[PDB]
Amino acid sequence: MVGLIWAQATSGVIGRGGDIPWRLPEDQAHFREITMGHTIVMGRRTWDSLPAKVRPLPGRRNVVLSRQADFMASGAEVVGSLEEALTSPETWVIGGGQVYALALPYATRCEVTEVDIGLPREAGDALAPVLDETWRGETGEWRFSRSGLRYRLYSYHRS
Ligand SMILES: NC(=O)c1ccc[n+]([C@@H]2O[C@H](COP(=O)([O-])OP(=O)(O)OC[C@H]3O[C@@H](n4cnc5c(N)ncnc54)[C@H](OP(=O)(O)O)[C@@H]3O)[C@@H](O)[C@H]2O)c1
Ligand SMILES: O=C(O)CCC(=O)c1ccc2c(c1)OCCCO2
Ligand SMILES: [Co+2]
Numbered sequence: 001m002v003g004l005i006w007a008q009a010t011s012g013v014i015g016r017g018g019d020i021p022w023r024l025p026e027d028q029a030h031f032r033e034i035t036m037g038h039t040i041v042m043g044r045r046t047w048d049s050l051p052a053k054v055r056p057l058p059g060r061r062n063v064v065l066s067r068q069a070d071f072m073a074s075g076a077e078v079v080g081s082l083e084e085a086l087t088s089p090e091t092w093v094i095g096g097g098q099v100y101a102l103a104l105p106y107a108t109r110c111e112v113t114e115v116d117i118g119l120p121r122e123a124g125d126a127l128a129p130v131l132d133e134t135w136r137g138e139t140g141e142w143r144f145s146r147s148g149l150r151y152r153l154y155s156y157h158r159s
Contacts, residue, residue, distance in 0.1 A: 002091045003109035004100055005034055007151075008128040009119035015096050015126030019049055024145045027113045030153070031094075034111055035060055038090040041082065043099040047073050061088065065099055082106070097126030104129050109157050116142070116150035134158045 007027050008014045036059050044066040047055065055075055056062035062076035063085040071078050079085050082102055093103040110131065121127065131137075140153040 001089065001108060002086060002093065002103060002106040003034075003111060004093045004103060004107050004129070005031060005111040006095055006100065006128055007113035007115055009115055009117045011119050011121050012128045013119045013121055013125045014128050016122065016124070018045060021119060022115055022117055022147070022149060024113070024115065024147055024149065024151055026143070026145050027115075027151065030111075030113065032057075035092045035094065038092055039063060039085060039088040041065060041085045041091060041093045041099065041103070043096050044068070044071060044073075044078075046094065046096045046099070047076065065102075095126075097128075100129045104131075108159065109155070110135070112154040112156060114152050114154060116152075131156060 006014050007024065014020070039061040040057060041063045042065070044064055047064045064071070064073040064076050064078045065082060065085070066078050067080060069080065077085070085091065086106065093099055093107070135156045135158050137154055137156045142150045142152045145151055
């Protein structure tokens, strides 16, 4: 099982300036629950976005995808191809935009947090991947984050 997990604005923006223009504590707990115990695969830029005191994320096989053969990610594995990282029963791709696109052929689940924030796409933004007709979606109710933004969870899946 390869799954993708991400939060996006209604516009599809997931990242800007190397970070994320919101923060939902409820989404971070949801992320931790879904990924805990499993492999997490991330692009090098997303590894960079994590503070050093946070990496690796605890209780998970942290895998960083990079083309630099000497890139050092302390506490993590660095692989040069996505296929290298798929040696566990559950693998969650945690971003960012480039790695979601690379991983989507392998994926049968997307746990998507839609954040009710009006955020026009700008040059250089990272974007959510486009899900084609093979994906079946189930939606939750709109909920209020304590940060003041509404959000809702979509669970997409396909055989
Ligand atoms: N909203 C969310 O839920 C969420 C979650 C995660 C990240 N984000 C945001 O997304 C943004 C980063 O996403 P990004 O698309 O800019 O970069 P990214 O996907 O996180 O990492 C890009 C890097 O991955 C490596 N890479 C990409 N394709 C590869 C391949 N085919 N083989 C080997 N290595 C490969 C390269 O690393 P080298 O350059 O080292 O080769 C590339 O520079 C940040 O803003 C981050 O905050 C958002
Ligand atoms: O998982 C934990 O241990 C606590 C929450 C956390 O560390 C976290 C939550 C969301 C993330 C993230 C980390 O980095 C990946 C890119 C953005 O999505
Ligand atoms: Co689990």
